[PDB]
Write a protein that holds these residues in place. Structure first.
Motif, PDB file in Angstrom:
ATOM      1  N   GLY E 124       0.801  -1.209   0.000  1.00  0.00           N
ATOM      2  CA  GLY E 124       0.000   0.000   0.000  1.00  0.00           C
ATOM      3  C   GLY E 124       0.836   1.263   0.000  1.00  0.00           C
ATOM      4  N   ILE E 125       1.708   1.416  -0.995  1.00  0.00           N
ATOM      5  CA  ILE E 125       2.660   2.521  -1.045  1.00  0.00           C
ATOM      6  C   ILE E 125       2.499   3.255  -2.369  1.00  0.00           C
ATOM      7  CG2 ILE E 125       5.073   3.214  -0.887  1.00  0.00           C
ATOM      8  CD1 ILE E 125       5.678   0.881   0.790  1.00  0.00           C
ATOM      9  N   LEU E 126       2.373   4.576  -2.297  1.00  0.00           N
ATOM     10  CA  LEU E 126       2.305   5.430  -3.472  1.00  0.00           C
ATOM     11  C   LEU E 126       3.705   5.853  -3.910  1.00  0.00           C
ATOM     12  CD1 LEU E 126      -0.657   7.759  -2.416  1.00  0.00           C
ATOM     13  CD2 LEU E 126      -0.754   5.982  -4.166  1.00  0.00           C
ATOM     14  N   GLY E 127       3.774   6.469  -5.086  1.00  0.00           N
ATOM     15  CA  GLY E 127       5.023   7.017  -5.569  1.00  0.00           C
ATOM     16  C   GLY E 127       5.381   8.311  -4.864  1.00  0.00           C
ATOM     17  N   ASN E 128       6.583   8.806  -5.164  1.00  0.00           N
ATOM     18  CA  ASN E 128       7.084  10.002  -4.494  1.00  0.00           C
ATOM     19  C   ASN E 128       6.261  11.235  -4.860  1.00  0.00           C
ATOM     20  OD1 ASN E 128       9.578  11.362  -3.015  1.00  0.00           O
ATOM     21  ND2 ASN E 128       9.205  12.537  -4.890  1.00  0.00           N
ATOM     22  N   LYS E 129       6.061  11.471  -6.159  1.00  0.00           N
ATOM     23  CA  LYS E 129       5.315  12.648  -6.590  1.00  0.00           C
ATOM     24  C   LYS E 129       3.841  12.538  -6.224  1.00  0.00           C
ATOM     25  CE  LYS E 129       8.453  13.756 -10.396  1.00  0.00           C
ATOM     26  NZ  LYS E 129       8.628  13.844 -11.869  1.00  0.00           N
ATOM     27  N   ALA E 130       3.267  11.337  -6.326  1.00  0.00           N
ATOM     28  CA  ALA E 130       1.875  11.147  -5.929  1.00  0.00           C
ATOM     29  C   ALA E 130       1.690  11.385  -4.435  1.00  0.00           C
ATOM     30  CB  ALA E 130       1.401   9.747  -6.312  1.00  0.00           C
ATOM     31  N   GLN E 131       2.628  10.898  -3.619  1.00  0.00           N
ATOM     32  CA  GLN E 131       2.558  11.129  -2.181  1.00  0.00           C
ATOM     33  C   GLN E 131       2.687  12.610  -1.855  1.00  0.00           C
ATOM     34  OE1 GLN E 131       1.902   8.796   0.204  1.00  0.00           O
ATOM     35  NE2 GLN E 131       1.868  10.451   1.717  1.00  0.00           N
ATOM     36  N   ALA E 132       3.591  13.312  -2.546  1.00  0.00           N
ATOM     37  CA  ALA E 132       3.730  14.749  -2.331  1.00  0.00           C
ATOM     38  C   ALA E 132       2.456  15.494  -2.714  1.00  0.00           C
ATOM     39  CB  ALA E 132       4.923  15.286  -3.122  1.00  0.00           C
ATOM     40  N   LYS E 133       1.842  15.119  -3.839  1.00  0.00           N
ATOM     41  CA  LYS E 133       0.612  15.776  -4.271  1.00  0.00           C
ATOM     42  C   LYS E 133      -0.531  15.512  -3.299  1.00  0.00           C
ATOM     43  CE  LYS E 133      -1.518  14.227  -7.822  1.00  0.00           C
ATOM     44  NZ  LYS E 133      -1.755  13.781  -9.221  1.00  0.00           N
ATOM     45  N   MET E 134      -0.640  14.276  -2.802  1.00  0.00           N
ATOM     46  CA  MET E 134      -1.675  13.956  -1.825  1.00  0.00           C
ATOM     47  C   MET E 134      -1.460  14.712  -0.520  1.00  0.00           C
ATOM     48  SD  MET E 134      -2.824  10.228  -0.349  1.00  0.00           S
ATOM     49  CE  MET E 134      -1.291  10.058   0.556  1.00  0.00           C
ATOM     50  N   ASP E 135      -0.205  14.816  -0.068  1.00  0.00           N
ATOM     51  CA  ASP E 135       0.089  15.579   1.142  1.00  0.00           C
ATOM     52  C   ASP E 135      -0.255  17.051   0.967  1.00  0.00           C
ATOM     53  OD1 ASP E 135       0.992  13.146   1.932  1.00  0.00           O
ATOM     54  OD2 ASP E 135       3.053  13.762   2.363  1.00  0.00           O
ATOM     55  N   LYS E 136       0.083  17.625  -0.191  1.00  0.00           N
ATOM     56  CA  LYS E 136      -0.236  19.027  -0.443  1.00  0.00           C
ATOM     57  C   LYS E 136      -1.742  19.251  -0.482  1.00  0.00           C
ATOM     58  CE  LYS E 136       0.757  22.878  -3.567  1.00  0.00           C
ATOM     59  NZ  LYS E 136       1.588  23.359  -4.702  1.00  0.00           N
ATOM     60  N   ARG E 137      -2.480  18.335  -1.117  1.00  0.00           N
ATOM     61  CA  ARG E 137      -3.932  18.464  -1.175  1.00  0.00           C
ATOM     62  C   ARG E 137      -4.556  18.340   0.211  1.00  0.00           C
ATOM     63  NH1 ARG E 137      -7.765  14.428  -2.593  1.00  0.00           N
ATOM     64  NH2 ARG E 137      -5.984  13.126  -3.210  1.00  0.00           N
ATOM     65  N   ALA E 138      -4.063  17.401   1.025  1.00  0.00           N
ATOM     66  CA  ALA E 138      -4.581  17.250   2.382  1.00  0.00           C
ATOM     67  C   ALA E 138      -4.286  18.481   3.229  1.00  0.00           C
ATOM     68  CB  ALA E 138      -3.994  15.998   3.033  1.00  0.00           C
ATOM     69  N   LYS E 139      -3.074  19.032   3.110  1.00  0.00           N
ATOM     70  CA  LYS E 139      -2.726  20.240   3.851  1.00  0.00           C
ATOM     71  C   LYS E 139      -3.592  21.420   3.429  1.00  0.00           C
ATOM     72  CE  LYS E 139      -0.400  23.533   5.978  1.00  0.00           C
ATOM     73  NZ  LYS E 139      -0.437  23.741   7.451  1.00  0.00           N
ATOM     74  N   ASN E 140      -3.811  21.584   2.121  1.00  0.00           N
ATOM     75  CA  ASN E 140      -4.641  22.687   1.645  1.00  0.00           C
ATOM     76  C   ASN E 140      -6.089  22.528   2.092  1.00  0.00           C
ATOM     77  OD1 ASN E 140      -2.222  23.246   0.405  1.00  0.00           O
ATOM     78  ND2 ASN E 140      -3.108  23.644  -1.619  1.00  0.00           N
ATOM     79  N   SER E 141      -6.615  21.301   2.057  1.00  0.00           N
ATOM     80  CA  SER E 141      -7.998  21.082   2.469  1.00  0.00           C
ATOM     81  C   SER E 141      -8.172  21.286   3.969  1.00  0.00           C
ATOM     82  CB  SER E 141      -8.455  19.682   2.059  1.00  0.00           C
ATOM     83  OG  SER E 141      -9.832  19.493   2.341  1.00  0.00           O
ATOM     84  N   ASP E 142      -7.184  20.872   4.769  1.00  0.00           N
ATOM     85  CA  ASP E 142      -7.284  21.054   6.213  1.00  0.00           C
ATOM     86  C   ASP E 142      -7.136  22.521   6.598  1.00  0.00           C
ATOM     87  OD1 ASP E 142      -7.474  18.341   6.123  1.00  0.00           O
ATOM     88  OD2 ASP E 142      -5.640  17.925   7.253  1.00  0.00           O
ATOM     89  N   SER E 143      -6.129  23.199   6.050  1.00  0.00           N
ATOM     90  CA  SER E 143      -5.827  24.576   6.412  1.00  0.00           C
ATOM     91  C   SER E 143      -5.605  25.407   5.159  1.00  0.00           C
ATOM     92  CB  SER E 143      -4.588  24.653   7.315  1.00  0.00           C
ATOM     93  OG  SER E 143      -4.757  23.866   8.481  1.00  0.00           O
ATOM     94  N   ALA E 144      -6.169  26.611   5.151  1.00  0.00           N
ATOM     95  CA  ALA E 144      -5.993  27.530   4.035  1.00  0.00           C
ATOM     96  C   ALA E 144      -4.626  28.206   4.104  1.00  0.00           C
ATOM     97  CB  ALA E 144      -7.101  28.570   4.024  1.00  0.00           C
TER      98      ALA E 144
END
Ligand SMILES: [Mg+2]
Ligand SMILES: [Mg+2]
Ligand SMILES: [Mg+2]
Ligand SMILES: [Mg+2]
Ligand SMILES: [Mg+2]
Ligand SMILES: [Mg+2]
Ligand SMILES: [Mg+2]
Lengths: 189, 92, 99, 180, 144
Positions: E124-144
Motif C-alpha cells: 500500500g505505497i504510493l510514488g514520491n510525486k503522488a505522495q507529495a501531491k496527496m500531502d499538499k492536497r490534504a494540507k490545503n484542504s485542512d488549512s488555508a
RNA sequence: UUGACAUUGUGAAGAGACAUAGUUUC
RNA sequence: GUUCUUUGUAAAGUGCCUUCGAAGAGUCGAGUUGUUUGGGAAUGCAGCUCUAAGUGGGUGGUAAAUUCCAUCUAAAGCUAA
RNA sequence: GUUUGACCUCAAAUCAGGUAGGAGUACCCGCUGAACUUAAGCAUAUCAAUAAGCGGAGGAAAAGAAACCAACCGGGAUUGCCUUAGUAACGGCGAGUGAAGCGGCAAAAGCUCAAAUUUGAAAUCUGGUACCUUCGGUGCCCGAGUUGUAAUUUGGAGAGGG
C-alpha cells in the motif's frame, strides 16, 4: 512432492494470489518481445507433465499471439487451427534447429494469448544418447507442429476413435479420396 | 411415420416353412427317421444353426415326431408340429 | 438377473454359466486418496474462494438454494455440476459457522 | 457430378500382388524358422444377435486364461501365444475351451533351450491349421419328446406382454405402497 | 571428499552422517512425514508458487519454519548456486541444545512476532510525486 | 452509428441486504 | 561348429497375509458466432464469454427431469507389416 | 563495509563444436480456397470440403495399442480389400441420392512418461584434456543439475512391510 500442490493451485485460477500473479506477469510479458527465450518454465510441473526435463537439450520459448477471428484479405471467418498451434509454428520457425515437443497456456489479455513452447535439441549428445528421447532425432519428426503432429495439431485435425470422428479418423482428405474412387477388378463384380 | 427406423431386438430373422423343415436333416438320416418315426428317438433340428430366425407353417409335414429348436415360431407351425407329434423347444 | 432362455421378454438371452472377472483397476480412476484429500484441503484453505463462489454463498445465505442452483447452472453449464457446487458451498458454510 | 475419371482404381496388379504376398510369406518363414508364421489365437463368441450362434478366432487369450493354463503373459508372448489384456471372461464354457487350447498347445510344442544344442525339426507354418477352431455341439442327434402342453407361441406372447407391462405394474405397486 | 569415503569402504570390504536436507520435493515430503526439526524457506523464489504453500503446510504439520533472505545463501549452505529450501532433520548430541534454543528463538522472533501482521495485505505505497501531491492536497484542504 | 461482455485496478462519502460486531450491491 | 572370463549371495519371474494404491485444467463441459456432415433435433473444428469434479469423468445418434444400467479412463508420448 | 563478494536476469566475441535454409514434389500431412457446370425457388444446393495459392516429411507418410464398438452367449490397437448396400432411409417412394456396427480376408506387436524421499551419501549427464583395443572406453578437470538428473511403477496395474 510439491508438484501436486502446484497442480491444484494452478487449477485454482480465480483466487486473489493467482490473479495478482497473472496481472504482474502479463505486464512483464507485454514489456518483453513477441517471441523470446525463457530462462526457466514458469510452470515446471506442467512442463514436466508435458515431457520437459531439466537437463541440457531442453529449451523454453515464450510467445504471444494476437486474438480474435481470421481476417480475409479483401479490400467473421474462423481459423481452423488454434492460436496455440500458430504460436508453436512461429517458435519452430524461429528455432528451426530444434524440434517442438509441446506447449502450454500461461496468460492472456484482450489482445494477446501467451504460451510457452518446449523444444528438444536433436543434435545434443545427451538427447542423442537418451533412449527415452532419441526418437525425436529421426528425420520423420521434422516440423511436427508444421505438419500438425503435436497435441494441439491432432486435436484440431480431429484424430480420435469413435463414431464422432468418422470423417477425420485417419486423414480427412485420405478418407475422402478412399471413398470417392471407382474400384474395378479384372473380373468385374 | 417419416424417417422411421425398424430397430428391434431381432433385426435378423429369416423365415422357414414346415414344407422345408425336413430339408435341414441330412438325406442319409432322413430316410431312416421317416421309416422309423419314434417318440423316444425323435430327430432334433436346430433351425438357428441352420441359419433361420422364425419357423412358419405354410406346408404339410408327415406324422413323424420331430424336436424343433427355434427362436420364434408361428401358432399354426407349432400346432402342426404338435399334431404330427413333435414339440417346439425355444432357444435364444 | 439370470437369463430366461428365450429370445424376447425381460432378461432374454442364452443361459450360460456365469463368471465374475476380477475388478479392473482403471475403473477406480477418480477415487479419493488421503494424499489428494490433504492437498486439496490445504490448497482450498490457502487460496480461498472464487468470486462466483462468494456470490453463490451470498445467494444461499440471503435467498433460495433453488436460485443458487439456477445461477450455478448458468455459470458452470450442467445442472449436475450446479448441484455439486451448491452442495460444496453448503458444506463450506456449515463447517465454517456451525462447526 | 464429380471428376471420377481422375480417380479410377483398376487392379491390374492382382496376380503380381499375389506373387509378392507369397514371396513375403516364404521369406518370413525362412527368416523365422522353425517357429510358425502365426500366434495361437483363442476361441471367442461373435457379438450381436445375428452372429452369436458361431464361434471364431479372437485377438488373444485373457490374463485369467493364461494364469489358469499356468503361464505368465510375458512368457506366453515369448513362446508364441497371443495375449489380450482387455478381453474379460464371463462364460465358463469359453474359459474352459481356451484353457484346453493353451494346454494342448503347450503339449504339442517344443521350446528350444537358450544355451545348448538345438534338436533340429521341420517347421510347421500354421498354428491355426494345427489347432483348428471347432464349433461346439449343442445337442445330440435324437432325443425323446417331452411335451406338457407348453404352447411356446403363448409363452412368447406372454413374455412380450409382461415386458410391455412391467413398468405400469411397478408404478401401481409404488402407489399402493405410498397410499398409507 | 565423497571419493575419500568410497576408497576407505573398498579397503574395509563408515559412521552415520548428519547433513542439511535440501531439495523441494524431499523437504516437502519430510515436512509431511513430520521428520524435519527446522525448515528454512528462501524468500526470493521465482516462480513463487513453488514455496507459497510452505508456511501453511508447516503450520498444519507442526514443523517450525522460518523465511530467510537468499536462495543463494541456502545454496552456499548446501553446495549449490541456489536452493529454494533447507531442512534440519537430525542433529548431534553436542548441538541438540543449540537447535532447541534456536527453535525457541525463531518461535519468539518470527512466528509469534509476525503472526498478526502476515494476515494483512501488502504493497500500500504510493510514488514520491503522488505522495507529495496527496500531502499538499490534504494540507490545503485542512488549512488555508 | 448504437448497446452488451472481457481487457478492469485502488480509496472516500451516501443509501441496501446476515438480525445495531463489517461480507457483499447501487 | 571351436575358444575366451564365467558372471553371481548382481538382476528377473512366481505363492500367502496386511497397509496402500499418487493417474495430465483456461482443460473437460456449456452458451454464442462462423464453417463442415446432416431430413431435422444434432456431429467435427475454430474464435469470443463462462468455467468444473474425484464412490469422479466421457460415451450410449428424439428433446427435458428422476432412478438405474452398460462400457471405457481424455485434456502427455513412441511404434514394423 | 561508501568495501569485498554470492546469486538472478540480460548481453558480447571471426570464442569451441554444431544445426536451419534451397532443390525435387508421383504418392503423404496441414493451411487456404474459387468459378465454369447441374438444378431448385421455406433467396439455395451442386461442382467441392475440388483446381489454383502457402507451409512441412519419408521410402512410404499418416493412423495406432480405446475416455472404442456394442446391448450379444458380447467383441478387443491401427491400416487396406471384399462386404455391409445400391440396403434402411429421401424422392409424382418412379427416375435418381444414399451410412455405420457386425461378417470374411491381407497383415499382425507391442509399449513409454507425469504424478512416490535415494536421503546411510545425484547413485545422472554435455564438454575439454591425456592415453587406448576409436560409430566408442578409461583417468583427470571445467561445468549442468536439488526451481530435480538416475534406479524403481503406468492402471492390464503396481508400491511399502511380514
Ligand atoms: Mg541450462
Ligand atoms: Mg505418431
Ligand atoms: Mg493445389
Ligand atoms: Mg529423401
Ligand atoms: Mg510398406
Ligand atoms: Mg510414422
Ligand atoms: Mg492402455
Amino acid at each position: 512432492g510439491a508438484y501436486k500442490y502446484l497442480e491444484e493451485l494452478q487449477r485454482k485460477k480465480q483466487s486473489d494470489v493467482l490473479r495478482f500473479l497473472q496481472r504482474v506477469r502479463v505486464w512483464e510479458y507485454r514489456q518483453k518481445n513477441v517471441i523470446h527465450r525463457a530462462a526457466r518454465p514458469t510452470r515446471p510441473d506442467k512442463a514436466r507433465r508435458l515431457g520437459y526435463k531439466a537437463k541440457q537439450g531442453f529449451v523454453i520459448y515464450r510467445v504471444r499471439v494476437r486474438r480474435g477471428n481470421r481476417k480475409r484479405p479483401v479490400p467473421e471467418l474462423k481459423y481452423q487451427r488454434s492460436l496455440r498451434a500458430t504460436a508453436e509454428e512461429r517458435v519452430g520457425r524461429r528455432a528451426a534447429n530444434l524440434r517442438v515437443l509441446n506447449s502450454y497456456w500461461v496468460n492472456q489479455d484482450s489482445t494477446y494469448k501467451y504460451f510457452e513452447v518446449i523444444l528438444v535439441d536433436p543434435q545434443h549428445k545427451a538427447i542423442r544418447r537418451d533412449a527415452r528421447y532419441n526418437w525425436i532425432c529421426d528425420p520423420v519428426h521434422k516440423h511436427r507442429e508444421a505438419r500438425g503432429l503435436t497435441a494441439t495439431g491432432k486435436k484440431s485435425r480431429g484424430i480420435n476413435k469413435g463414431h464422432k470422428f468418422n470423417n477425420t479418423k485417419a486423414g480427412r482428405r485420405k478418407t475422402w479420396k478412399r471413398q470417392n474412387t471407382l474400384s474395378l477388378w479384372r473380373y468385374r463384380k | 411415420m417419416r424417417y422411421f427406423h425398424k430397430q428391434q431386438a431381432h433385426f435378423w430373422k429369416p423365415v422357414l416353412n414346415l414344407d422345408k423343415l425336413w430339408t435341414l436333416i441330412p438325406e442319409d438320416k432322413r430316410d431312416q427317421y421317416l421309416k422309423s418315426a419314434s417318440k423316444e428317438t425323435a430327430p432334433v433340428i436346430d433351425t438357428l444353426a441352420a441359419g433361420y430366425g422364425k419357423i412358419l407353417g405354410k406346408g404339410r409335414i408327415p406324422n413323424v415326431p420331430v424336436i424343433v429348436k427355434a427362436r420364434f415360431v408361428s401358432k399354426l407351425a407349432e400346432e402342426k408340429i404338435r399334431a404330427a407329434g413333435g414339440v417346439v423347444e425355444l432357444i435364444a | 438377473t439370470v437369463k430366461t432362455g428365450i429370445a424376447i421378454g425381460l432378461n432374454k438371452g442364452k443361459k450360460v454359466t456365469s463368471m465374475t472377472p476380477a475388478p479392473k483397476i482403471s475403473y477406480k480412476k477418480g477415487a479419493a486418496s488421503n494424499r489428494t484429500k490433504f492437498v486439496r484441503s490445504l490448497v482450498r484453505e490457502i487460496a480461498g474462494l472464487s468470486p462466483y463462489e462468494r456470490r453463490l454463498i451470498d445467494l444461499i445465505r440471503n435467498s433460495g438454494e433453488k436460485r443458487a442452483r439456477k445461477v450455478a447452472k448458468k455459470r458452470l453449464g450442467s445442472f449436475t455440476r450446479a448441484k455439486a457446487k451448491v452442495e460444496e458451498m453448503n458444506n463450506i458454510i456449515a463447517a465454517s459457522r456451525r462447526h | 457430378r464429380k471428376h471420377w475419371q481422375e480417380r479410377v482404381k483398376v487392379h491390374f496388379d492382382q496376380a503380381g500382388k499375389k506373387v509378392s504376398r507369397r514371396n513375403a510369406r516364404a521369406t518370413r518363414a525362412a527368416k523365422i524358422a522353425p517357429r510358425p508364421l502365426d500366434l495361437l489365437r483363442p476361441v471367442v463368441r461373435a457379438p450381436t444377435v445375428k452372429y452369436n450362434r458361431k464361434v471364431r478366432a479372437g485377438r488373444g487369450f485373457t490374463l485369467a486364461e493364461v494364469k489358469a493354463a499356468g503361464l505368465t503373459a510375458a512368457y506366453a508372448r515369448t513362446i508364441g501365444i497371443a495375449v489380450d489384456h482387455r478381453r474379460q471372461n464371463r462364460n465358463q464354457e469359453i474359459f474352459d475351451a481356451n484353457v484346453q487350447r493353451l494346454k494342448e498347445y503347450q503339449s504339442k510344442i517344443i521350446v528350444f533351450p537358450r544355451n545348448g544344442k538345438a534338436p533340429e525339426a521341420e517347421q510347421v507354418l500354421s498354428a491355426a491349421a494345427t489347432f483348428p477352431i471347432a464349433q461346439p455341439a449343442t445337442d445330440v442327434e435324437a432325443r425323446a419328446v417331452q411335451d406338457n402342453g407348453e404352447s411356446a407361441f403363448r409363452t412368447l406372447r406372454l413374455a412380450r406382454s409382461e415386458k410391455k407391462f412391467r413398468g405400469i405394474r411397478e408404478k401401481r405397486a409404488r402407489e399402493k405402497a405410498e397410499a398409507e | 571428499e565423497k571419493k575419500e569415503r568410497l576408497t576407505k569402504e573398498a579397503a574395509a570390504v563408515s559412521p552415520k552422517p548428519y547433513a542439511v536436507k535440501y531439495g523441494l520435493n524431499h523437504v516437502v515430503a519430510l515436512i509431511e512425514n513430520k521428520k524435519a526439526k527446522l525448515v528454512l524457506i528462501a524468500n526470493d523464489v521465482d516462480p513463487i508458487e513453488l514455496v507459497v504453500f510452505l508456511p501453511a503446510l508447516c503450520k498444519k504439520m507442526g514443523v517450525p519454519y522460518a523465511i530467510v533472505k537468499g536462495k543463494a545463501r541456502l545454496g552456499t549452505l548446501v553446495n549449490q548456486k541456489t536452493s529454494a529450501v533447507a531442512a534440519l532433520t537430525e542433529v548431534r548430541a553436542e548441538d541438540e541444545a543449540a537447535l532447541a534454543k534456536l527453535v525457541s528463538t525463531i518461535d519468539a522472533n518470527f512466528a509469534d512476532k509476525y503472526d498478526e501482521v502476515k494476515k494483512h495485505w501488502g504493497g500500500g505505497i504510493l510514488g514520491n510525486k503522488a505522495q507529495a501531491k496527496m500531502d499538499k492536497r490534504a494540507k490545503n484542504s485542512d488549512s488555508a
